[PDB]
Amino acid sequence: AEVYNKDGNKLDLYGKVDGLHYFSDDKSVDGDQTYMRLGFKGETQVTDQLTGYGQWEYQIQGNAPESENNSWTRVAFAGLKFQDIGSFDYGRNYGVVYDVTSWTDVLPEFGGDTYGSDNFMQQRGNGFATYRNTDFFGLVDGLNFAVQYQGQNGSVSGENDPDFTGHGITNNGRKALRQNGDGVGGSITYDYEGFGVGAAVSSSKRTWDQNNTGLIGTGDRAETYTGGLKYDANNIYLAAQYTQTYNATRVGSLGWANKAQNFEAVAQYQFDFGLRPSVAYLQSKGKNLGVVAGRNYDDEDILKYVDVGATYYFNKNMSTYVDYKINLLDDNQFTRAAGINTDDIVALGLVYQF
Amino acid sequence: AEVYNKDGNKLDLYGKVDGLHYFSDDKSVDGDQTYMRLGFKGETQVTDQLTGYGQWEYQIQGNAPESENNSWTRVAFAGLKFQDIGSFDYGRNYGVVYDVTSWTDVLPEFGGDTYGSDNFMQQRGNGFATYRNTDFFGLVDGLNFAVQYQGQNGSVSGENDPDFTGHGITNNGRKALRQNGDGVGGSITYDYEGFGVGAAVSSSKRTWDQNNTGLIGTGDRAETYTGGLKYDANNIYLAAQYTQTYNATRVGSLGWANKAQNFEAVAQYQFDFGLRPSVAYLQSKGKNLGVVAGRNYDDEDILKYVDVGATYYFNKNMSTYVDYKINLLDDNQFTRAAGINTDDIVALGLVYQF
Amino acid sequence: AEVYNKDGNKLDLYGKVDGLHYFSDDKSVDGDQTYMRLGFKGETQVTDQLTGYGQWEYQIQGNAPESENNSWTRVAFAGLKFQDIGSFDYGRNYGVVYDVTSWTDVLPEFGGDTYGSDNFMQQRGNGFATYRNTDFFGLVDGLNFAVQYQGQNGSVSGENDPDFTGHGITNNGRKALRQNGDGVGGSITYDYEGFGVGAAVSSSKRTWDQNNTGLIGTGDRAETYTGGLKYDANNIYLAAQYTQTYNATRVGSLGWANKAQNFEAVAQYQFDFGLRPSVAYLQSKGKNLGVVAGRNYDDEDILKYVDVGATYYFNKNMSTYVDYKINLLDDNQFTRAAGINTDDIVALGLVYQF
Ligand SMILES: CCCCCCCCCC
Ligand SMILES: CCCCCCCCCC
Ligand SMILES: CCCCCCCCCC
Ligand SMILES: CCCCCCCCCC
Ligand SMILES: CCCCCCCCCC
Ligand SMILES: CCCCCCCCCC
Ligand SMILES: CCCCCC
Ligand SMILES: CCCCCC
Ligand SMILES: CCCCCC
């Protein structure tokens, strides 16, 4: 909600509370999943052409006891936008690969999980410098593109930390699975009369910890190549994305896939009375994975499920949903070693937002 | 404060800063206790009869150094209210037992501590599904009731976690003392010309960890039976609550009382010039407690104190208070083993709220 | 921004997002430093003369992965202000020594680091009771003073905590380096036609942990004596502060300087077109430090650098800066033992604020 708008500056203070419950045989996801989000979008008018802006978003789990706190920053960035020249922002933000893969990240509860957070330039991560251009300098309507750089987020600097290695240290160190070296990426999208087409590419240097702490999927670089299609008109939403990755797709907590072929497709319709049915298919197929937890593998499913669900919108501030993950992965030594969910999940949600 | 009210949606952004200091011989409570609360109540008008709502409340300690952060969610829920039919909400919320026991939880600083948080269905906890009905479908003024369900909040799912057992795992695992199985509860209250009468009952299944990790007060279920009385009129506030519990009242960090008889009573008056004196008595008497930390017990006091204090209200946004816990527990092997405060505490508070 | 102003109460909900990056050979500070601040200043009008107020400020790091959360309260206090009599507030706040030393804490990114947080009464800390008087009861314009008390913030109360000692326990325990005993301080400042002069003194009792856990700089008390000068007019800002400390200046994580002589000086000019160049010098000279990490020392530099930089203000809501720490400390056994940064740092910042 816009809580302030005066002297060439406005502030949108937004958030949501999602009363959420998972039903599953997988007890590590079963039960109360209640959470909330809080954030602000701020925008100041410097000149007629120049805009300054800042955005921050925070998730706070609502399913924990008061003896603990599970919360985190999703995004936190500041930037400048000049009319028909482009925008530049820096901070924690979305990687440009998500410009295209977001087209399928529209399910009521699940979806969007052939990649993760702090996963190179595929979704949210630290230290993104992002240039964006809308309508090609105002010359070609519907033609957007983006060029992005991500600085290294490396190893821990404290010598007594258990994860300490001494290689690729940065101030904001973390575990190898959420590290990254210097990276560059770009996206291009074209919209025309409801139809949309998109491509995105990213190439990140991999850190020392990522290639020398016994994790699978080692190599000099992590790469992604994404193509996307969508139709968004007449209350119909169809979308599909195909991404091919190299040393970039996480295989649970074991490391990365040497190569992965990811596919997501979704079909949705929006009734005027408030109901919005959703059907989707997601798969991540690892290729030539090699040795994983004591056994040799070639091709293995990392993710594979059909998603059936529905959201009912009471209005723009209140909604409820059901989402049903029909999991098609088999329970095997690969999935157990990686700790990948292979059971079905039903989600029931009640959401207030402002 | 109401910071937004437009297009059938309003947002109350509220909070307080309590500059608070404890004086006590008990050094584990002595010293700076400064804290703050922040929250929002959001409400959207869907139709003339149907309201959607969401609420979130967060406590952040103000007595810690910047090298740490001690904060937590108190409540986080979303819901729907239909005129003369009832309300339904889900999330982290207050258990229905608190509908009656809250009548005595009105002291300046202390009180409200014959039960705790994440303590089955007695106060705040995760995964409450709560149906509420006010004025019996609009037919009997002053007659409210509630029916509540709490889903299991069980053991940790991570095999390498030190608290891991493998039994009763849920996604949002925690220590046995703050766990709970499936639970059901209800409350009924009747108000008439200042006088009030209330009853509440809860029955929760106890988890495996709760009955097999060496904690006292084991059994199939945790049960509470509460009766309450109050008078709230002519600037006078009197209230009393009696609760009898089975395997539900925590005896410090040792487990639970096999049986407990809890009693709280409070008398307050509100002068027009701003002063509000307060006198109260609280006791929790454990019955047939059995073996506790190497010794056999029958009846023992878990809690016993008189509370004398006063709040002065400068206005609705600013107040100050003194609260004096006159502790009647003796320092003995039981209280030391449980880690229960047995010394007197004086609290001085200065509170800004919005 | 003022998001509420009604019924004799107003609320300023403020904050900033700083997209920030450090370039340094020191890898423990190199990389993404993005962060945000959030806070509120609330003020209620009780009578024509009496004002009630509360303030809270929170920092949340924007450079971490979502698997962790690095945040903290900077200030959290409530208070009362009576016209021409003074103000009183209690909570987490700034020590009165900072009334004078803040005059040099005005650099784009660095500076203000001859002292730290939770460092006795020198900057932010827990449990400050602060009396402030502006314009000497309204009798002498430009003459301010302050009298402050800080309650003990001592050792941890949990017997199984690794930092447990059993001495000087308070409820809000923490590590010796951020502990303090009972302390008293005062400041006096006089402003006249742009020029300013200030003096401040603090004396804190040192805790048992501080003098018996193998830390350097032991003694009965921690003392500071500060003198300050400034000129703030005609778009020119000049300021200098000199502080002499005893058992109060932290030498990295090793303890404190027996004695320290701190000096900060800054010169800034503000162009109307938005640019604000900055040049500064900071030094902390330890005196008679004694034995430190196996070697005997007399005089050693704890801090020594020149700071060159600039801030460009697009407007009051958006700015960008560069800051260049030219580090004059040599890399030696003292600095390595203390873990003090001895390399140069360049900072680039883009800041949105509201
Ligand atoms: C022309 C308005 C009615 C359109 C009906 C849409 C049916 C969609 C079924 C998925
Ligand atoms: C096992 C208890 C299930 C609780 C259902 C909560 C539903 C909330 C969203 C409507
Ligand atoms: C009729 C107004 C005066 C009432 C005085 C109340 C005295 C209360 C003492 C506790
Ligand atoms: C030992 C120092 C006591 C500090 C008192 C603070 C009072 C704050 C509430 C008025
Ligand atoms: C009178 C307006 C112009 C003043 C110029 C200031 C120059 C400052 C150089 C640091
Ligand atoms: C303008 C502030 C943000 C600049 C970010 C620079 C990133 C450096 C990559 C090594
Ligand atoms: C196995 C039952 C699934 C039902 C979800 C709607
Ligand atoms: C022992 C002194 C108690 C005073 C509290 C008002
Ligand atoms: C060593 C290069 C420093 C430049 C900072 C402006």
CSV table of N, CA and C in Angstrom, one decimal, chain A residues 4 6-9 44-46, chain C residues 1 15-16 312-319 351-354:
chain,number,residue,atom,x,y,z
A,4,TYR,N,2.8,6.9,1.6
A,4,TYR,CA,3.5,8.2,1.5
A,4,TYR,C,3.7,8.6,0.1
A,6,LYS,N,4.7,12.5,-1.4
A,6,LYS,CA,4.8,13.9,-1.2
A,6,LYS,C,6.2,14.4,-1.5
A,7,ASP,N,6.4,15.6,-2.0
A,7,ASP,CA,7.7,16.2,-2.3
A,7,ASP,C,8.5,15.3,-3.2
A,8,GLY,N,7.9,14.9,-4.3
A,8,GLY,CA,8.6,14.0,-5.3
A,8,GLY,C,9.2,12.7,-4.8
A,9,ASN,N,8.6,12.2,-3.7
A,9,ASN,CA,8.9,10.8,-3.2
A,9,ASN,C,7.7,10.1,-2.7
A,44,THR,N,11.7,8.1,-6.0
A,44,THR,CA,11.8,9.5,-6.0
A,44,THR,C,12.0,10.1,-7.4
A,45,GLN,N,11.4,11.2,-7.7
A,45,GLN,CA,11.4,11.9,-9.0
A,45,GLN,C,12.5,13.0,-8.9
A,46,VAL,N,13.7,12.8,-9.5
A,46,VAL,CA,14.8,13.7,-9.4
A,46,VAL,C,14.6,14.8,-10.4
C,1,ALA,N,9.9,9.0,6.4
C,1,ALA,CA,8.7,9.8,5.9
C,1,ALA,C,7.6,9.8,7.0
C,15,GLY,N,14.1,5.0,6.6
C,15,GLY,CA,15.0,3.9,6.3
C,15,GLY,C,15.8,4.2,5.1
C,16,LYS,N,16.8,3.3,4.7
C,16,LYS,CA,17.6,3.5,3.5
C,16,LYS,C,18.0,2.1,3.0
C,312,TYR,N,27.6,12.6,-4.0
C,312,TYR,CA,26.8,13.4,-4.9
C,312,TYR,C,25.3,13.2,-4.5
C,313,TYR,N,24.6,14.3,-4.2
C,313,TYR,CA,23.2,14.2,-3.8
C,313,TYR,C,22.3,14.6,-5.0
C,314,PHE,N,21.6,13.6,-5.6
C,314,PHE,CA,20.6,13.8,-6.6
C,314,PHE,C,19.5,14.7,-6.0
C,315,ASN,N,19.0,14.3,-4.9
C,315,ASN,CA,18.1,15.1,-4.1
C,315,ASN,C,18.2,14.5,-2.6
C,316,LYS,N,17.2,14.9,-1.8
C,316,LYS,CA,17.2,14.4,-0.4
C,316,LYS,C,16.8,13.0,-0.2
C,317,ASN,N,16.4,12.3,-1.3
C,317,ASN,CA,16.1,10.9,-1.2
C,317,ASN,C,17.0,9.9,-1.9
C,318,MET,N,17.9,10.5,-2.7
C,318,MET,CA,18.8,9.7,-3.5
C,318,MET,C,20.2,10.3,-3.6
C,319,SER,N,21.2,9.5,-3.4
C,319,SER,CA,22.6,9.9,-3.5
C,319,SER,C,23.6,8.8,-3.9
C,351,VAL,N,22.6,5.1,-2.8
C,351,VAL,CA,21.7,5.1,-1.6
C,351,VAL,C,20.3,5.7,-1.9
C,352,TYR,N,19.3,4.9,-1.7
C,352,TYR,CA,17.9,5.4,-1.7
C,352,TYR,C,17.5,5.5,-0.2
C,353,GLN,N,16.9,6.6,0.2
C,353,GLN,CA,16.4,6.8,1.5
C,353,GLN,C,15.1,7.5,1.5
C,354,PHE,N,14.3,7.3,2.6
C,354,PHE,CA,12.9,7.9,2.7
C,354,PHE,C,12.7,8.2,4.2
